[PDB]
Design a protein around this ligand. Structure first.
Ligand code: MG
Ligand code: MG
Ligand code: MG
Ligand code: MG
Ligand code: MG
Ligand code: MG
Ligand code: MG
Ligand code: MG
Ligand code: MG
Ligand code: MG
Ligand code: MG
Ligand code: MG
Ligand code: MG
Ligand code: MG
Ligand code: MG
Ligand code: MG
Ligand code: MG
Ligand code: MG
Ligand code: MG
Ligand code: MG
Ligand code: MG
Ligand code: MG
Ligand code: MG
Ligand code: MG
Lengths: 52, 252, 121, 233
RNA sequence: UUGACAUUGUGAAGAGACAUAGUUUCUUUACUUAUUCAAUGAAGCGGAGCUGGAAUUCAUUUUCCACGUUCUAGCAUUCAAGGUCCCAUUCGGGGCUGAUCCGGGUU
RNA sequence: GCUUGUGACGGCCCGUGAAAAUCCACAGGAAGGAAUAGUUUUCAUGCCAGGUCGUACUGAUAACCGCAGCAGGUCUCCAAG
RNA sequence: GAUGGGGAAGCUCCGUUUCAAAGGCCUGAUUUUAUGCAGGCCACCAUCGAAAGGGAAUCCGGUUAAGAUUCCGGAACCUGG
């Protein structure tokens, strides 16, 4: 693997020669939704901490 | 006289533990700021077979409090914990099959496994497949907690001492007959050099106390006193009774 | 005044001043003269009826070389002692504690000449 | 404000790697450190006797400074001065012919343990200074006791090396005096007076009190908030 | 194995004699500094304060609690972005703050 | 078809059947780089260099061990009709 | 199986990260000069131990009385610079 050219060890997408695409699919969606739901839980307990 | 088999297991030359394949030492997380003030999360990334242990282990990976990295733990998987699951460890942590909690922190009657004797000793009691300790109630001031170890004994230990919710997996393994010599053979092949065993009374006086005589018999009480000397303690050591257990045992 | 601040739990060795060595008598008065000069490197020419068959039909010199010497030392001293140039060197140890050498000369030179220049045949 | 943002950091368990702090209190010191530290500790925990612990009662910066002042006016000869005395008395006295006394009488601080102690015994010392360091403490502990019995004023100064400098050594343990040029003779008694205040007179009263017995703060604080609750309901 | 003596110190309740003053001796139970057991690339201990808040106020607090993370098999590092102050305005770079004080007993 | 190699699978276990060097990628974005001229030596092509020791042959009804040119013993690969 | 240690009258025994202040790289700092301090990493704690385990890279033809994946011819490949 050190006697061969860089594009024998990657596919062009992020996390190339590391994870299996369908696996990258997941960490995208999970990341977004969570960082989104991490925000849904901002207001909700901003509201409990100002109206209980 | 020779030196009897059960003396030679001491300098353990062929008598040690067959240790090559074992996944590592099963131990609780070291007890730090997280667990003793709050809680912390890990993911069980794998539960796997240990060679020479009846119960599955669970590999449970965490973050590091004080450096950017990961830290990886070997737990004994309490029955039900699963890959991907989240695991919590600490004082203010929850009551679910798999988290680790100070003994004070669980309502009396809970069920915990791999539980410390002294806090922070990182695991100690109820670790075999199927075993657990039940809690029978706490002592508010001087923070103790009385429990019932699998042997039925009732020991009192710290409430800061940690346990983990549930019974241990792989239970009931021993309800199944080993059936032939071979399965026994392999069983102990991965454990240590104890099998097979040769009835003392099959050998010669050199070899044993039970050894010798024109008939295969023991010749004297096979109940040997506590304060016996190495070379003597063979047979039923220090027994306070003997004979077929009639009636209901069970702890009181 | 006030104290120090250690950001690390660990206490390492005070990386202090390691000083030079400056004598007062000499190591050894008079140093040793070069132990393996060219003349001690290659010792004798090997003159088998099959050693010449190498020189004749192969452009290959043969030498009994001092065991204490490698290829780098043979090639340089074959060069220096015979004013020639070497293609490659093969060495073996003979079953009597002597180190043979199958020296080979570049496409230019002719061993045979170079052989009975030094005077053997 | 411009293209810049503010998004602090949640250092609160289970998130965000802890920032580097001053772990100064939690460092695994070298064993040689532990030893000198815990020896200090060990020394304070016990109930140290009155023939010792009657040390720990040093002088004070004020009264001491005045004694370091007055005693510097009586340093011993340096190498220079003595060799200089030599030739100013070599050719001088060996030719000019004096009774070896074309040379002045010197007025200087006496020192060196065995020196000072013969002095106290001959009632000739007039003010003795005692170190508070001396790790072989048995070398000097009998000096306060002695001075009192020989009716001689004394005081335990802070520093064994500080005494040293005013005598041209590294360390001197004890300095003392028998001579004093009459220019100073008066300021001396104004020193000896305050000296006899904090030491020579307090000595008998001092011999009754056992030092130490002090708790570590984690302990004192524990007990301070327990002998507080069992009494005030 | 079981006793005594040494290692062996410091408190209090109760007893033991000169025969109902405390120098001394033990039954019970406290102290940490000797000794012993454990843990960790000695990481957050102990004391005080902020904040809230359960608390009921018997002049104001007479107190006890807490005092950043829980639908998801993601991400979490460059003394940190922010704020603010300096170096004589370079690119670079330093304090303080962000991260409450006090004691240096790692727990 | 024989031998061997390899695959996708299936049975088996209170047995679930090594470790280390080493090599690759990845996340990360400290940095460093363009218009009159930079960036590239994981693309191609070109240059020098690779030391030391073993290397014969026997491996057995005679090259090993059995007092020996001993009907004994002594790990293994290839294997036609 | 050395080391810091701890045992042992002692030959030695114990322990291998263990009650130890254990150690070294990427480069910046020189433009008195060769290598100190400046950063920041790393706390990795010896070493020996497989010619059947792990493992960078070679092939065909020709040649000797006896060597050859080793020489010769020809065609490759790996590592370091
Ligand atoms: Mg590709
Ligand atoms: Mg073992
Ligand atoms: Mg056996
Ligand atoms: Mg049997
Ligand atoms: Mg028999
Ligand atoms: Mg017998
Ligand atoms: Mg018997
Ligand atoms: Mg018998
Ligand atoms: Mg029988
Ligand atoms: Mg060779
Ligand atoms: Mg076959
Ligand atoms: Mg499998
Ligand atoms: Mg290239
Ligand atoms: Mg080299
Ligand atoms: Mg051969
Ligand atoms: Mg033969
Ligand atoms: Mg034979
Ligand atoms: Mg050894
Ligand atoms: Mg090796
Ligand atoms: Mg191999
Ligand atoms: Mg051939
Ligand atoms: Mg030949
Ligand atoms: Mg052959
Ligand atoms: Mg190259």
């Amino acid at each position: 693997y050190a006697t061969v050219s860089k594009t024998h060890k990657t596919v062009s997408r992020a996390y190339g020669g590391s994870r299996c695409a369908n696996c990258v699919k997941e960490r995208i969606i999970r990341a977004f939704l969570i960082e989104e739901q991490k925000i849904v839980k901002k207001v909700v307990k901003e509201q409990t901490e100002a109206a209980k | 006289g020779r030196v009897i088999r059960n003396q030679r297991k001491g300098a353990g030359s062929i008598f040690t533990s067959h240790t090559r394949l074992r996944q590592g030492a099963a131990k609780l997380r070291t007890l730090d700021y997280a667990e003793r003030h709050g809680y912390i999360r890990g993911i069980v990334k794998q539960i796997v077979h240990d060679s020479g242990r009846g119960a599955p282990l669970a590999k449970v990976v965490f973050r590091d409090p004080y450096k950017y990295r990961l830290r990886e733990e070997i737990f004994i998987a309490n029955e039900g914990v699963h890959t991907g699951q989240f695991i919590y460890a600490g004082k203010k942590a929850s009551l679910n099959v798999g988290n680790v909690l100070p003994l004070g922190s669980v309502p009396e009657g809970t069920i915990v496994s791999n539980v410390e004797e002294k806090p922070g000793d990182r695991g100690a009691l109820a670790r075999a497949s199927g075993n657990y300790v039940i809690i029978i109630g706490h002592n508010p001031d001087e923070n103790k907690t009385r429990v019932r170890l699998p042997s039925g004994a009732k020991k009192v230990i710290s409430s800061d001492a940690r346990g983990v919710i549930g019974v241990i997996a792989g239970g009931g393994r021993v309800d199944k007959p080993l059936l032939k010599a071979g399965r026994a053979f392999h069983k102990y092949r991965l454990k240590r050099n104890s099998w097979p065993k040769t009835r003392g009374v099959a050998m010669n006086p050199v070899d044993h106390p039970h050894g010798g005589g024109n008939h295969q018999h023991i010749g004297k009480a096979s109940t040997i006193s506590r304060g016996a000397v190495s070379g003597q303690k063979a047979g039923l050591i220090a027994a306070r009774r003997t004979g077929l257990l009639r009636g209901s045992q069970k702890t009181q | 005044k006030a104290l120090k601040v250690r950001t690390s739990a660990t206490f390492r060795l005070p990386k202090t001043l390691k000083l030079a060595r400056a004598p007062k008598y000499a190591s050894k008065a008079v140093p040793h003269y070069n132990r393996l000069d060219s003349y001690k490197v290659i010792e004798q020419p090997i003159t088998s009826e099959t050693a010449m068959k190498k020189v004749e039909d192969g452009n290959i010199l043969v030498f009994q070389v001092s065991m204490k010497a490698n290829k780098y030392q043979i090639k340089k001293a074959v060069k220096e002692l015979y004013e020639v140039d070497v293609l490659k060197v093969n060495t073996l140890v003979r079953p009597n504690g002597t180190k043979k050498a199958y020296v080979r000369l570049t496409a230019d030179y002719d061993a045979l000449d170079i052989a009975n220049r030094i005077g053997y045949i | 404000n411009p293209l810049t943002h503010s998004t602090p950091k949640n250092f609160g368990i289970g998130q965000a790697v802890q920032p580097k702090r001053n772990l100064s209190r939690y460092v695994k010191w070298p064993e040689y450190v532990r030893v000198q530290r815990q020896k200090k500790i060990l020394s304070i925990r016990l109930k140290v006797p009155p023939t010792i612990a009657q040390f720990q009662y040093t002088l004070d910066r004020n009264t001491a400074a005045e004694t370091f002042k007055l005693f510097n006016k009586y340093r011993p000869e340096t190498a220079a001065e003595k060799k200089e005395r030599l030739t100013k008395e070599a050719a001088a006295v060996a030719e000019a012919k004096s009774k070896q006394d074309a040379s002045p009488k010197p007025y200087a601080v006496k020192y060196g343990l065995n020196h000072v102690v013969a002095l106290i015994e001959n009632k000739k010392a007039k003010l003795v200074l005692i170190a508070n360091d001396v790790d072989p403490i048995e070398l000097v502990v009998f000096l306060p006791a002695l001075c009192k019995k020989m009716g001689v004023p004394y005081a335990i100064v802070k520093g064994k090396a500080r005494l040293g400098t005013l005598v041209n050594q590294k360390t001197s343990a004890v300095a003392a005096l028998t001579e004093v040029r009459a220019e100073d003779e008066a300021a001396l008694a104004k020193l000896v007076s305050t000296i006899d205040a904090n030491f020579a007179d307090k000595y008998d009263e001092v011999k009754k009190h056992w030092g130490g017995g002090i708790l570590g703060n984690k302990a004192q604080a524990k007990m301070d908030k327990r002998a507080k609750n069992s009494d005030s309901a």
